[PDB]
Amino acid sequence: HAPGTDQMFYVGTMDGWYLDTKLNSVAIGAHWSCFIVLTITTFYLGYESWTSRGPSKRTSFYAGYQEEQNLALFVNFFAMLSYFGKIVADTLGHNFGDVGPFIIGFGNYRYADYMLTCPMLVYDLLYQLRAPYRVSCSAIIFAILMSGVLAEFYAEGDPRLRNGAYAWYGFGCFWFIFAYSIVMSIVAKQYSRLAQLAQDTGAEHSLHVLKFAVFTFSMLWILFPLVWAICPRGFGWIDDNWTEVAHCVCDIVAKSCYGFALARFRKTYDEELFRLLEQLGHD
Amino acid sequence: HAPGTDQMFYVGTMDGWYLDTKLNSVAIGAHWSCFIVLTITTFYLGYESWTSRGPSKRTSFYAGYQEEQNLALFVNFFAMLSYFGKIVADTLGHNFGDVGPFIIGFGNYRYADYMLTCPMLVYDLLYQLRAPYRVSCSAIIFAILMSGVLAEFYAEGDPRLRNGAYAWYGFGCFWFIFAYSIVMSIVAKQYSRLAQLAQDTGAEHSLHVLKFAVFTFSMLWILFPLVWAICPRGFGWIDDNWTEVAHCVCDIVAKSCYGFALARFRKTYDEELFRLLEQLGHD
Amino acid sequence: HAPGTDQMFYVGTMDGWYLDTKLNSVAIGAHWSCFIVLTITTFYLGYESWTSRGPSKRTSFYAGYQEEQNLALFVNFFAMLSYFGKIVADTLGHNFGDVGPFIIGFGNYRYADYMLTCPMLVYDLLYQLRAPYRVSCSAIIFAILMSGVLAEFYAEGDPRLRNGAYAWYGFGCFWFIFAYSIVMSIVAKQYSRLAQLAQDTGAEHSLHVLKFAVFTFSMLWILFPLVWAICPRGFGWIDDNWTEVAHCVCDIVAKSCYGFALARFRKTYDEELFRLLEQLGHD
């Protein structure tokens, strides 16, 4: 297994797959609650998607053609799946943390669940303001998430290779800072152009609601490096058992609040601001 | 390997990769026949694709721009690859069932071969009638297939974890029933609108051929849960050796018959029904 | 591990992951140089992409909407990542050749790094001439690369299964010959139509530069089967230590020269040839 040491590493193997769970009761309860709320948000958003009329309220299957409107749905849907298998683990009492086979887009690994969620989510949110460079942000966050997965892989491995985890941490943090700066800049410029093009709208309160939602949604990603630093992978100011509840509340804020905000926006928007958004998505 | 038991599980490991095959002569012959017919259907469909003129029969490389017309080709092509490696296993006499490394889109695992085939196939068939919600059905079937792969992973594992296989079976069956119901509903509504918009067509017999093909193609997926139930993973009314021939005949019906039906449709369709399909794909 | 033999195979396992490196100083230096030049080319191309004006030189974020112009960027970007982890291995002195977990699009395996690079690269280059059958070439090269990965998997395995490596070699070479022939034919026909439609251009020297670039770029892929034949996987006229430098120079020619050629083309093209390319992309 390892040279010079009789200890063996169970990460990425079926041997660690059959090990008993290292979680406690509160982690299982948090997983259950997160799965329940993800499922009910997915059901509610799908119910709204089935009864989703167009802006003119006469087009029947508007979501059937403008399928990107349902895009967040899929992400939220996958989030439910991203936890459902863990619930199965919570049923069986066996180890599930970074063990077993590696499959893209599943919650069997800590950061690999975000492969199909995070780039689509950021693409959808910047598409809602018709911001340019749609593919670029998704590619950047995909690369950062892959770096995070590989850093977590080095974290559990041989302690002689512990130094690479900090290097990949620095890599991911540098690209995340760059991505956050560029997305904040483009969002600020785009919404400034929208505001200077927002004359005689009649939805100023709705405009305030949407600007508050998008600014909070842009600034929410400050959780990831703080959470990584406070867990034992970084400075270790918290223990492992309280990391799972943190990840649950963070990705609930990321997904369910996003779905609720989009649902509340779609029941209050009007058509002239819509056509001004299409006008904005030109230059 | 496993606590309390000296037995070891060879699934997902190189140890089970080097094991001798568990198949018999008839399974090898069925694999050979299925690979041969898949290869000849792929060759025939590619030959038709090279000599594929437009509806006006003057556009030379119509398939070169409307590349989605070749889409089924790719699926059928991958199906050939999906069996070709198994033929190599049939050459070497070593174990190939759910062993070795896991790679997306290959036939080394029982259900993982359908990753690149089934969503593209369903998208192509519902696109042929210009049905809405194109991405949604593909995402649903992708999630169901991933659930099936993971259920098959639990099936071979530790018998103390056998209960999760039935839970994932219920999950996959519930979402498959939902998908089948919604796709049947949308197909029925879409073709009802086509029929009430099909006046003075001149291709009523061709219309009967295409409706028979699409209805049979919509109802063919009843094979999957019945096949899973009759094999030892479910009720076990059949043995393992006769499961491979069942999967061969089922995916041949799924792919080669689809290609033959599309080829026969493209040599008999006319242009006014074509433009009425574009008219249908509006509301 | 293996029946009848006490030897064990370290491929695809964490046991071979923790093994010491089999590389020497020159391989590490070549990896460092290749990573450095890939990083600087990515930085330069990103700097050009940020300051990328439209053909009329008044559209500010032309790349923000015509995002496919940045497509090669992403490939080159991934190439940097495709080597960066190897640099980490070169830091740690542990084995990295075809060991550890298998992840799509990474350089941990010899041919798996090209999953996200080669089809996008060929799609971008044939899109630059507006050639038809865009998806088909990408699918063909994806299948060939997957076959190469699996052949390399058989190469390291049990010597009783060495015969399958030659079969997959023949498969990959046959499909590569077919792909090369068809891409050469379509490129020749397309550029012949461009030349017979190139009247009063004013950029004949620029036309010569671009034709030389595209012909060299079309003929560069002759490196892959020659490199595979000369390494010990084939005829073995060279040793393992000199294969890494060959792969470095080959993929540098594939990626950095492509980026430099595209950058030099974008600083010299004019608008009438541009609109003639859009006219060409019709029939």
PDB file of N, CA and C in Angstrom, chain C residues 71-72 74-82 105-107 111-125 138 141-142 145 221 224 251 254-255 258:
ATOM      1  N   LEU C  71     -12.774  29.674 -28.367  1.00  0.00           N
ATOM      2  CA  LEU C  71     -12.855  28.232 -28.142  1.00  0.00           C
ATOM      3  C   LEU C  71     -11.472  27.602 -28.029  1.00  0.00           C
ATOM      4  N   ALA C  72     -10.578  27.932 -28.969  1.00  0.00           N
ATOM      5  CA  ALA C  72      -9.216  27.406 -28.935  1.00  0.00           C
ATOM      6  C   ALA C  72      -8.534  27.729 -27.613  1.00  0.00           C
ATOM      7  N   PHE C  74      -9.830  27.815 -24.645  1.00  0.00           N
ATOM      8  CA  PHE C  74     -10.192  26.817 -23.647  1.00  0.00           C
ATOM      9  C   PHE C  74      -9.353  25.560 -23.815  1.00  0.00           C
ATOM     10  N   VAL C  75      -9.207  25.095 -25.061  1.00  0.00           N
ATOM     11  CA  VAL C  75      -8.397  23.910 -25.325  1.00  0.00           C
ATOM     12  C   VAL C  75      -6.980  24.132 -24.823  1.00  0.00           C
ATOM     13  N   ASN C  76      -6.378  25.260 -25.216  1.00  0.00           N
ATOM     14  CA  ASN C  76      -5.028  25.573 -24.772  1.00  0.00           C
ATOM     15  C   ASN C  76      -4.993  25.670 -23.256  1.00  0.00           C
ATOM     16  N   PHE C  77      -6.027  26.293 -22.678  1.00  0.00           N
ATOM     17  CA  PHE C  77      -6.126  26.398 -21.229  1.00  0.00           C
ATOM     18  C   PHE C  77      -6.090  25.014 -20.602  1.00  0.00           C
ATOM     19  N   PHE C  78      -6.913  24.099 -21.126  1.00  0.00           N
ATOM     20  CA  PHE C  78      -6.962  22.759 -20.558  1.00  0.00           C
ATOM     21  C   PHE C  78      -5.621  22.065 -20.720  1.00  0.00           C
ATOM     22  N   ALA C  79      -4.921  22.356 -21.825  1.00  0.00           N
ATOM     23  CA  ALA C  79      -3.603  21.776 -22.040  1.00  0.00           C
ATOM     24  C   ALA C  79      -2.664  22.139 -20.903  1.00  0.00           C
ATOM     25  N   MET C  80      -2.720  23.397 -20.447  1.00  0.00           N
ATOM     26  CA  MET C  80      -1.913  23.805 -19.303  1.00  0.00           C
ATOM     27  C   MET C  80      -2.262  22.949 -18.095  1.00  0.00           C
ATOM     28  N   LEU C  81      -3.562  22.814 -17.814  1.00  0.00           N
ATOM     29  CA  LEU C  81      -3.990  21.950 -16.721  1.00  0.00           C
ATOM     30  C   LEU C  81      -3.544  20.521 -16.977  1.00  0.00           C
ATOM     31  N   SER C  82      -3.606  20.096 -18.246  1.00  0.00           N
ATOM     32  CA  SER C  82      -3.236  18.736 -18.616  1.00  0.00           C
ATOM     33  C   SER C  82      -1.796  18.420 -18.254  1.00  0.00           C
ATOM     34  N   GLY C 105     -10.452  13.879 -19.222  1.00  0.00           N
ATOM     35  CA  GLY C 105      -9.916  15.180 -19.559  1.00  0.00           C
ATOM     36  C   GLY C 105      -8.639  15.568 -18.847  1.00  0.00           C
ATOM     37  N   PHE C 106      -8.075  14.690 -18.028  1.00  0.00           N
ATOM     38  CA  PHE C 106      -6.854  14.985 -17.295  1.00  0.00           C
ATOM     39  C   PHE C 106      -5.668  14.232 -17.887  1.00  0.00           C
ATOM     40  N   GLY C 107      -4.475  14.747 -17.604  1.00  0.00           N
ATOM     41  CA  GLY C 107      -3.223  14.189 -18.063  1.00  0.00           C
ATOM     42  C   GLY C 107      -2.661  13.070 -17.215  1.00  0.00           C
ATOM     43  N   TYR C 111      -3.492   9.221 -23.015  1.00  0.00           N
ATOM     44  CA  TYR C 111      -4.354   9.724 -24.074  1.00  0.00           C
ATOM     45  C   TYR C 111      -5.646  10.343 -23.559  1.00  0.00           C
ATOM     46  N   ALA C 112      -5.969  10.156 -22.278  1.00  0.00           N
ATOM     47  CA  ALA C 112      -7.214  10.683 -21.728  1.00  0.00           C
ATOM     48  C   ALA C 112      -7.211  12.203 -21.607  1.00  0.00           C
ATOM     49  N   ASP C 113      -6.052  12.847 -21.753  1.00  0.00           N
ATOM     50  CA  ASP C 113      -6.002  14.302 -21.649  1.00  0.00           C
ATOM     51  C   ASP C 113      -6.662  14.970 -22.848  1.00  0.00           C
ATOM     52  N   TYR C 114      -6.766  14.252 -23.964  1.00  0.00           N
ATOM     53  CA  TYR C 114      -7.226  14.836 -25.216  1.00  0.00           C
ATOM     54  C   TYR C 114      -8.741  14.820 -25.371  1.00  0.00           C
ATOM     55  N   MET C 115      -9.469  14.293 -24.377  1.00  0.00           N
ATOM     56  CA  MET C 115     -10.924  14.170 -24.457  1.00  0.00           C
ATOM     57  C   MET C 115     -11.589  15.517 -24.709  1.00  0.00           C
ATOM     58  N   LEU C 116     -11.188  16.538 -23.956  1.00  0.00           N
ATOM     59  CA  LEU C 116     -11.774  17.862 -24.090  1.00  0.00           C
ATOM     60  C   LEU C 116     -10.978  18.778 -25.006  1.00  0.00           C
ATOM     61  N   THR C 117      -9.852  18.313 -25.545  1.00  0.00           N
ATOM     62  CA  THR C 117      -9.010  19.172 -26.369  1.00  0.00           C
ATOM     63  C   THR C 117      -9.156  18.859 -27.856  1.00  0.00           C
ATOM     64  N   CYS C 118      -8.931  17.601 -28.242  1.00  0.00           N
ATOM     65  CA  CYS C 118      -8.851  17.271 -29.666  1.00  0.00           C
ATOM     66  C   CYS C 118     -10.156  17.479 -30.433  1.00  0.00           C
ATOM     67  N   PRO C 119     -11.328  16.994 -29.981  1.00  0.00           N
ATOM     68  CA  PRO C 119     -12.547  17.261 -30.767  1.00  0.00           C
ATOM     69  C   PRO C 119     -12.888  18.736 -30.867  1.00  0.00           C
ATOM     70  N   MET C 120     -12.710  19.491 -29.781  1.00  0.00           N
ATOM     71  CA  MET C 120     -12.957  20.926 -29.840  1.00  0.00           C
ATOM     72  C   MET C 120     -11.970  21.616 -30.773  1.00  0.00           C
ATOM     73  N   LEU C 121     -10.708  21.179 -30.765  1.00  0.00           N
ATOM     74  CA  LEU C 121      -9.701  21.773 -31.639  1.00  0.00           C
ATOM     75  C   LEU C 121     -10.026  21.521 -33.108  1.00  0.00           C
ATOM     76  N   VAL C 122     -10.384  20.278 -33.453  1.00  0.00           N
ATOM     77  CA  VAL C 122     -10.689  19.982 -34.850  1.00  0.00           C
ATOM     78  C   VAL C 122     -11.975  20.682 -35.279  1.00  0.00           C
ATOM     79  N   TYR C 123     -12.960  20.772 -34.377  1.00  0.00           N
ATOM     80  CA  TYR C 123     -14.192  21.495 -34.674  1.00  0.00           C
ATOM     81  C   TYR C 123     -13.915  22.970 -34.924  1.00  0.00           C
ATOM     82  N   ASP C 124     -13.037  23.568 -34.114  1.00  0.00           N
ATOM     83  CA  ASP C 124     -12.692  24.972 -34.297  1.00  0.00           C
ATOM     84  C   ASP C 124     -11.970  25.189 -35.622  1.00  0.00           C
ATOM     85  N   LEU C 125     -11.022  24.311 -35.968  1.00  0.00           N
ATOM     86  CA  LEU C 125     -10.253  24.542 -37.188  1.00  0.00           C
ATOM     87  C   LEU C 125     -11.106  24.337 -38.436  1.00  0.00           C
ATOM     88  N   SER C 138     -15.562  15.496 -34.810  1.00  0.00           N
ATOM     89  CA  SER C 138     -15.336  15.465 -33.370  1.00  0.00           C
ATOM     90  C   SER C 138     -15.703  14.109 -32.784  1.00  0.00           C
ATOM     91  N   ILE C 141     -12.962  11.516 -33.866  1.00  0.00           N
ATOM     92  CA  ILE C 141     -11.701  11.624 -33.138  1.00  0.00           C
ATOM     93  C   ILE C 141     -11.898  11.257 -31.670  1.00  0.00           C
ATOM     94  N   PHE C 142     -13.087  11.518 -31.115  1.00  0.00           N
ATOM     95  CA  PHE C 142     -13.377  11.094 -29.749  1.00  0.00           C
ATOM     96  C   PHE C 142     -13.367   9.575 -29.633  1.00  0.00           C
ATOM     97  N   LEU C 145      -9.740   8.354 -29.920  1.00  0.00           N
ATOM     98  CA  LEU C 145      -8.987   8.604 -28.696  1.00  0.00           C
ATOM     99  C   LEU C 145      -9.402   7.653 -27.579  1.00  0.00           C
ATOM    100  N   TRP C 221      -1.203  15.666 -37.855  1.00  0.00           N
ATOM    101  CA  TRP C 221      -1.578  14.486 -37.068  1.00  0.00           C
ATOM    102  C   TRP C 221      -0.885  13.199 -37.502  1.00  0.00           C
ATOM    103  N   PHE C 224       0.985  11.034 -34.465  1.00  0.00           N
ATOM    104  CA  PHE C 224       0.435  10.076 -33.502  1.00  0.00           C
ATOM    105  C   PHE C 224       0.745   8.615 -33.819  1.00  0.00           C
ATOM    106  N   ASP C 251       2.453  17.991 -28.874  1.00  0.00           N
ATOM    107  CA  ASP C 251       1.264  18.735 -28.476  1.00  0.00           C
ATOM    108  C   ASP C 251       1.528  20.234 -28.363  1.00  0.00           C
ATOM    109  N   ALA C 254       0.826  21.179 -31.763  1.00  0.00           N
ATOM    110  CA  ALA C 254      -0.618  21.090 -31.964  1.00  0.00           C
ATOM    111  C   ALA C 254      -1.351  22.306 -31.402  1.00  0.00           C
ATOM    112  N   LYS C 255      -0.940  22.796 -30.231  1.00  0.00           N
ATOM    113  CA  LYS C 255      -1.709  23.811 -29.518  1.00  0.00           C
ATOM    114  C   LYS C 255      -1.126  25.216 -29.606  1.00  0.00           C
ATOM    115  N   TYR C 258      -0.997  26.529 -33.114  1.00  0.00           N
ATOM    116  CA  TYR C 258      -2.367  26.832 -33.518  1.00  0.00           C
ATOM    117  C   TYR C 258      -2.804  28.188 -32.976  1.00  0.00           C
TER     118      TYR C 258
END
